Design a binder for these strands. Structure first.
Lengths: 93, 75, 85, 97, 91, 76, 98, 93
DNA sequence: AATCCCGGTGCCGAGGCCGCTCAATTGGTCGTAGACAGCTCTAGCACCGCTTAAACGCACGTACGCGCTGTCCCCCGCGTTTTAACCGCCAAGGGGATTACTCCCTAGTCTCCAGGCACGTGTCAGA
DNA sequence: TCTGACACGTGCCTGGAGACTAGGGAGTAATCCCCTTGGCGGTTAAAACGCGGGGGACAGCGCGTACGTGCGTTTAAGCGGTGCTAGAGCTGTCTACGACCAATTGAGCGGCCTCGGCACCGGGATT
């Protein structure tokens, strides 16, 4: 039997980040898992479309910046791109 | 489609926020619901038939809905 | 008035669950007979069917109240469908 | 993971990179792309859970568990995340009054 | 003669294909909107027309939907509540 | 938006098929037109800025429109 | 006609369709039969649109022999299947159906 | 200057096959060319989604049979699949 | 009172031919992943029975639906005057587009271990 | 308060990670010229304003019927407990074929040319 790949551990850690004693049901865990999956699919598909349009072969951070800019609403997009750039810069050093 | 009773349509309408329902609304709602379910199942059947399987798992229905536009979370 | 708030506050499945299964299997047989289903996919096909009809009826309510009425009529459903596809 | 903690994130950066490769969105996938995707996913998840926690306190009952009804209400109330999720039907969710 | 030139324009401007918005003020509006993001951005002559035609299509569809709602309301005069209803039902 | 004259809104409405137009429709249609154009331009500038270009081309506008589900034909 | 398109009897190019599929990075590998099938589907859809546009041009009072964008728009909007696929699609300088 | 690739010759050949005396303007050429491009992208995106969901790497005829059945309406899709299968059977043998 | 058919035209604008090249086509090798067969046990369909929520048929009132009436001012629609939009033209030059080149960044391989997960259980929300 | 439900302990296993190699491709400099800006003037469609009036928008009134609400009967849904088995999920394997490379070449494209199809405009039919 193949192991099941989900985001339950990371979602639980994210919830513990804000409120430690906060908890969520199994159905809510599936809801957040599906939200993560389809947001990943949306952003990755937008980045792939950008790559195809610009005739490139690399889905890097720059492509994902534009994918996040196009998919997310502007007020949330600003925070999301700021967080992504911060994480990329922190990882590079 | 006639199995979908008047009570279920009335309850869905109450969740939709109406106060009164005409007597002709029920047939139209039954027709729309049957058409929507027919499309969703027609599409999940295509997804299932590609996989060389003869079962419609929740993933297939979710994908069929996602292509249609009405995305679904929790399956 | 009471039932509107009762059903908006509630979150349970509203359509009958066995007649809906019968409708799904009838449609599948109409497409091509012999196809088997999954007990975890009928609920998925129902929670997105009741959501669609609930949204359509809320749009119908908006259309009818916009017309000065409080009762939905087939022309309201037709306007809601024609306005979205 | 080494890169998940090095980047300063809680979401995986190996899972995201492997998922991107397996999706074949592009032939080559940059190493920084996985970090960026993991960061964006983590921020979106954190914002969704922050909205859920905020909206759970406003309930008449001080429930300490996020039922699908509560997260659906939190999504529906917010304008920004609500516009993003304006067409999704959360399983066993509901409609805001 | 209320009810003659109205249908004259309905049949005149529904059989036509040329642009309806005045090109220069729409171009000014597009450039003013773009200036709020990055000043000095340049627009291809074809890109402005491609945006103008899509905006024309969107406004025409929205106004036709609003007219459908107004007719459903038993009127012939479109009002802001009709536009709000059409926008709410569409998205 | 004040450059979007009453005549343009009236012509758009006649093409849409309305008979009579209220005196308040013009302002709301101006608002929705401005919002749509703002969305389209803010979406096309992302494509233009990604490709290191300082010129928003018709392909970028078409892609931006396709993002919103308003696919446009004849500009590519 | 291309050698690998004529052998299949199509009009659209099988080779160029396959090259477009590979350049788009839709999948890691693309079968040879997939390019043929996509070329056939595109050819059929273009042929259907052209047939509908020709019929709509014939339906006009003027016996025009040139396919104006208005004719294509009318043929699309009057059909029940090609007008549902091409919903939310704006034909440039095509106007709207009366 | 790099050569630009369009379906002008192919669309014109299809028109001549449909009716030898017909023609279309340059704008209609662009409309039909963008129609073909949009349908190419829409079918190929669904085929890629099918490949991704079922964890495969080959985009063959079946991945496009199912894509055509998924995207287009039933009556038009039936003819499209019939023509695609006919062409594939012609090419294979 | 307004709206459609057609003759001549000039005015393009789509189609046609020549040179050329980039991409298509062919032959050969090789590795890969897709199709096939078998094992296994999951769950999917079928059935029986209890409880009862729910559907449904009827009686009855009302109150919202629909039509009618009256007003009134909110918009057609016409003429004047303004004015700004459309087009063509001249340059300036910023920047798009193409090519050559460099390196750095990523695919692929090999080896290693630990992060993730499945089961069981420990301990706590809720009706 | 028992019932149900989310999260540690622990071991198991595949994939994340580091080192190394090898090109692929993204980024950059150089260069050319294309297209965008721009501003201007000449023209003429368009609109902004003032105005009269007329006809739909809006509200009140009245009649009625159909929709809701309550009573009472009936129907099958839900579940859930069991039973049988059809087929999904997983593992090996053995090829067909798709990628990649070297060589060949022709189908398509850019440029120049061509010719007739047709949008137009007024004049004469029509509504």
């Amino acid at each position: 039997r193949q192991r099941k790949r989900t985001w339950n551990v990371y979602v639980s850690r994210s919830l513990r980040s804000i409120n430690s004693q906060m908890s969520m049901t199994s159905r809510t865990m599936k809801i957040v898992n599906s939200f993560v999956n389809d947001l990943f699919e949306r952003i990755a598909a937008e980045a792939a479309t950008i790559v195809r349009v610009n005739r490139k072969r690399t889905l890097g951070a720059r492509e994902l910046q534009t994918a996040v800019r196009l998919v997310l609403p502007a007020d949330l997009a600003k925070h999301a791109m700021a967080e992504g750039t911060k994480a990329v810069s922190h990882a590079s050093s | 489609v006639r199995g979908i009773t008047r009570g279920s349509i009335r309850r869905l309408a109450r969740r939709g926020g109406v106060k009164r329902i005409s007597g002709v609304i029920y047939d139209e709602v039954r027709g729309v619901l049957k058409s929507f379910v027919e499309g969703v199942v027609r599409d999940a059947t295509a997804y299932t038939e590609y996989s060389r399987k003869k079962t419609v798992t929740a993933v297939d229905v979710v994908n069929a809905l996602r292509k249609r536009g009405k995305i679904l979370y929790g399956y | 008035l009471r039932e509107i708030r009762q059903f908006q506050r509630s979150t349970d499945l509203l359509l009958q669950k066995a007649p809906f299964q019968r409708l799904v299997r009838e449609v599948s047989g109409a497409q091509k007979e012999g196809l088997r289903f999954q007990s975890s996919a009928i609920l998925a096909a129902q929670e997105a069917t009741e959501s669609y009809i609930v949204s359509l009826l809320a749009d119908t309510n908006r259309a009818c109240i916009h017309s000065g009425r409080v009762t939905i009529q087939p022309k309201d459903i037709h306007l809601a469908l024609c306005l979205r596809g | 993971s080494s890169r998940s903690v090095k980047a300063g994130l809680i979401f995986p950066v190996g899972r995201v990179g492997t998922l991107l490769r397996r999706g074949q969105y592009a032939r080559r996938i940059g190493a920084s792309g996985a970090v960026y995707m993991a960061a964006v996913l983590e921020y979106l998840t954190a914002e969704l859970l922050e909205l859920s926690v905020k909206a759970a306190a406003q309930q008449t009952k001080k429930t300490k568990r996020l039922t699908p009804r509560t997260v659906t209400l939190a999504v529906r109330h917010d304008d920004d995340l609500g516009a993003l999720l304006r067409n999704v039907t959360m399983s066993r969710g509901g409609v805001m009054p």
